Amino acid sequence: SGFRKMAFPSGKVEGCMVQVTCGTTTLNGLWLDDVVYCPRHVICTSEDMLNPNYEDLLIRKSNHNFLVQAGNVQLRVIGHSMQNCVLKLKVDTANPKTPKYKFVRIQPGQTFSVLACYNGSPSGVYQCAMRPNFTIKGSFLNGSCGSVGFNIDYDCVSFCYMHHMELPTGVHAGTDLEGNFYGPFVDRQTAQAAGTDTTITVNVLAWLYAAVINGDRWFLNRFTTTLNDFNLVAMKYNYEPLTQDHVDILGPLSAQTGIAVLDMCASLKELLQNGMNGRTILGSALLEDEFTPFDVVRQCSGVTFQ
Amino acid sequence: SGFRKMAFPSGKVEGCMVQVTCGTTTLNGLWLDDVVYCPRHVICTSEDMLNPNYEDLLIRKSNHNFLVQAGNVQLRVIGHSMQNCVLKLKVDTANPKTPKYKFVRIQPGQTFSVLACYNGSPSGVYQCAMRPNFTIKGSFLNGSCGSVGFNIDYDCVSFCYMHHMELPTGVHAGTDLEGNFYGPFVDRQTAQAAGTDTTITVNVLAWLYAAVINGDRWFLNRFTTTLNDFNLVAMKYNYEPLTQDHVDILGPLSAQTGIAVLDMCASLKELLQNGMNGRTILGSALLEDEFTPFDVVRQCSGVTFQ
Numbered sequence: 224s225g226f227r228k229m230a231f232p233s234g235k236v237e238g239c240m241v242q243v244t245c246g247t248t249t250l251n252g253l254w255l256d257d258v259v260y261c262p263r264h265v266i267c268t269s270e271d272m273l274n275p276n277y278e279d280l281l282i283r284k285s286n287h288n289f290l291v292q293a294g295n296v297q298l299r300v301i302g303h304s305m306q307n308c309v310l311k312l313k314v315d316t317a318n319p320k321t322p323k324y325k326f327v328r329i330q331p332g333q334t335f336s337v338l339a340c341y342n343g344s345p346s347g348v349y350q351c352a353m354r355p356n357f358t359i360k361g362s363f364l365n366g367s368c369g370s371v372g373f374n375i376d377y378d379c380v381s382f383c384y385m386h387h388m389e390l391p392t393g394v395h396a397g398t399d400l401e402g403n404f405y406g407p408f409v410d411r412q413t414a415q416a417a418g419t420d421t422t423i424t425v426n427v428l429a430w431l432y433a434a435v436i437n438g439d440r441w442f443l444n445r446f447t448t449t450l451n452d453f454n455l456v457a458m459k460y461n462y463e464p465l466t467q468d469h470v471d472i473l474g475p476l477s478a479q480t481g482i483a484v485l486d487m488c489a490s491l492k493e494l495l496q497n498g499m500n501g502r503t504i505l506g507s508a509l510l511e512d513e514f515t516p517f518d519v520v521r522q523c524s525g526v527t528f529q
Numbered sequence: 530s531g532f533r534k535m536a537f538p539s540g541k542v543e544g545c546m547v548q549v550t551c552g553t554t555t556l557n558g559l560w561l562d563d564v565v566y567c568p569r570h571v572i573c574t575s576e577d578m579l580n581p582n583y584e585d586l587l588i589r590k591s592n593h594n595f596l597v598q599a600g601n602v603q604l605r606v607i608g609h610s611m612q613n614c615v616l617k618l619k620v621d622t623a624n625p626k627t628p629k630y631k632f633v634r635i636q637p638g639q640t641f642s643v644l645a646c647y648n649g650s651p652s653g654v655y656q657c658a659m660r661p662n663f664t665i666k667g668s669f670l671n672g673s674c675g676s677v678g679f680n681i682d683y684d685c686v687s688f689c690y691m692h693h694m695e696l697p698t699g700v701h702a703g704t705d706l707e708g709n710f711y712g713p714f715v716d717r718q719t720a721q722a723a724g725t726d727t728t729i730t731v732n733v734l735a736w737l738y739a740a741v742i743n744g745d746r747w748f749l750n751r752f753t754t755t756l757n758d759f760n761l762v763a764m765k766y767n768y769e770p771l772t773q774d775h776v777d778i779l780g781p782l783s784a785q786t787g788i789a790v791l792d793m794c795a796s797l798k799e800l801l802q803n804g805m806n807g808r809t810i811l812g813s814a815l816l817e818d819e820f821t822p823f824d825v826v827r828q829c830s831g832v833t834f835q
């Protein structure tokens with residue numbers, strides 16, 4: 224029993240983190256095979272932050288302008304290139320700790336683990352969701368750029384996020400590992416704002432199923448509803464509308480508890496219109512939307528990895 | 530003078546189009562160096578459309594199950610792999626007509642050219658925009674899957690779109706060339722719906738500047754407005770809000786015409802609240818939002834490519 228904000232074990236990723244220095248700027252890089260990946264704004268100075276021309280800035284660099292350190296061992300840069308917003312540094316030594324990996328782009332509402340790093344050294348791991356406005360509510364300080372987000376599927380690490388910047392509202396923005404930003408953001412130190420966020424409805428429903436599995440039942444009722452009736456209430460409270468695909472995804476949780484999805488939607492409708500009245504669910508006084516249906520199954524039924 | 534829906538010259542792309550057959554299914558592929566890229570649902574049959582397991586379907590295939598034709602020359606498949614939603618077929622011959630290229634992921638509101646193809650043969654070219662709901666309003670018939678979208682930057686072809694499917698509403702969905710879908714869609718023949726579309730405001734403003742450059746001035750007025758006052762009216766009419774970044778992008782057009790952006794916004798406010806009253810702008814009775822500021826500059830000031 225129990226329910227926690229659970230991250231993936233980070234060991235396979237810790238061995239890929241390196242320190243990348245260019246000039247007076249130091250941040251984190253990801254070392255897979257003989258390539259080091261890092262944010263391209265490492266080649267920027269204070270004079271170029273507001274409007275950098277990265278093509279010009281890169282042509283004025285040579286391999287010896289890039290210092291790469293894996294712990295205390297230094298890696299020799301033998302080539303460099305730019306792929307969208309990430310810098311690819313070819314080094315003379317292939318990482319012997321390279322795991323089975325792939326580069327994936329995730330969708331809003333999906334979760335992943337973040338290995339926060341400083342000076343190439345892992346500091347902590349935590350779980351977060353990609354928000355519908357393509358930001359993440361992370362925890363990052365100065366020097367954390369190049370930290371990566373990942374999921375583990377069996378023996379394979381799926382890298383999905385590299386950290387680039389913090390927005391004025393305190394939320395965080397980055398790219399996939401091909402260097403393409405999540406959301407309408409650019410790597411320039413200008414004032415950019417995220418659009419309005421919404422609550423991830425399918426995740427809230429999954430979390431309510433986790434509550435029932437763990438013995439929190441006070442919010443259930445006998446009523447039922449339709450998808451269109453529910454979605455009418457949901458839009459009023461800034462909730463993402465619910466699709467038939469979402470209902471299918473929640474199938475294994477409806478079967479394990481014997482509570483139909485549309486039945487659980489009726490409970491959620493009541494919680495939105497009346498609140499929780501000083502009661503808690505799984506130790507929270509708010510509706511939690513950063514657990515996917517898969518996260519719940521993984522924690523309330525059991526999955527490990529090799 | 531004049532203003533047209535202008536596409537990029539397609540010659541550099543026509544030489545990369547091939548036909549890919551697997552079983553009874555034939556669609557289009559993109560042949561760059563010694564790799565052929567195509568939608569992975571080419572390995573699906575009618576029995577798997579609703580819920581394909583692509584890992585299983587691919588392990589049951591061998592290289593000789595894939596017939597690749599470049600005109601009449603046949604290409605020998607020596608390897609195959611899956612990267613997200615695209616199939617990568619390694620062939621024995623590198624395309625001698627491979628142009629300088631890169632793979633880019635575009636943002637909503639940006640435009641590109643589509644080379645519609647059938648049986649590996651180019652049929653037509655047209656311009657379209659990525660909608661804010663991550664669909665495109667294309668023109669595609671049966672057999673068009675694998676057609677690609679592209680921009681040309683100097684001598685370099687930037688591939689940004691590969692066509693996968695048509696949604697029930699008649700709009701179209703696809704992936705970038707790394708196989709990651711635009712929008713919340715999956716390559717399964719289930720019922721999926723696009724979210725609500727909005728009008729791309731910065732593009733409408735660019736188009737109004739093109740009108741002024743070409744002698745349509747009847748909608749101008751002496752008034753001005755603020756960003757927050759404009760955005761309040763815009764949201765009422767399902768227009769994307771306007772940012773300071775957008776104002777900067779429109780700079781070259783404001784300078785060429787001597788009409789400040791916030792002045793042009795005041796004209797747009799009036800057109801939204803009063804309509805056009807049987808008058809036309811650049812031969813249209815509706816406000817056009819599929820030309821970017823760069824498209825206008827390119828056509829109203831002059832850019833060619835090598």
Ligand SMILES: Cc1c(Cl)cc(N2CCN(C(=O)c3cc(=O)[nH]c(=O)[nH]3)CC2)cc1Cl
Nearest residue numbers: 264267363364365366367388389410411412
């Ligand atoms: C072009 C450009 C851009 Cl776009 C960003 C930076 N910065 C690099 C330094 N930096 C952090 O390390 C950091 C991350 C974080 O999440 N929170 C926090 O407080 N600090 C801020 C971003 C520099 C340049 Cl030249």
Ligand SMILES: Cc1c(Cl)cc(N2CCN(C(=O)c3cc(=O)[nH]c(=O)[nH]3)CC2)cc1Cl
Nearest residue numbers: 570573669670671672673694695716717718
């Ligand atoms: C898993 C899967 C998926 Cl997701 C899609 C298809 N289709 C392949 C055939 N096809 C077209 O060629 C087509 C495109 C278009 O835009 N308009 C139109 O009328 N037809 C439809 C999609 C097949 C499979 Cl097995």
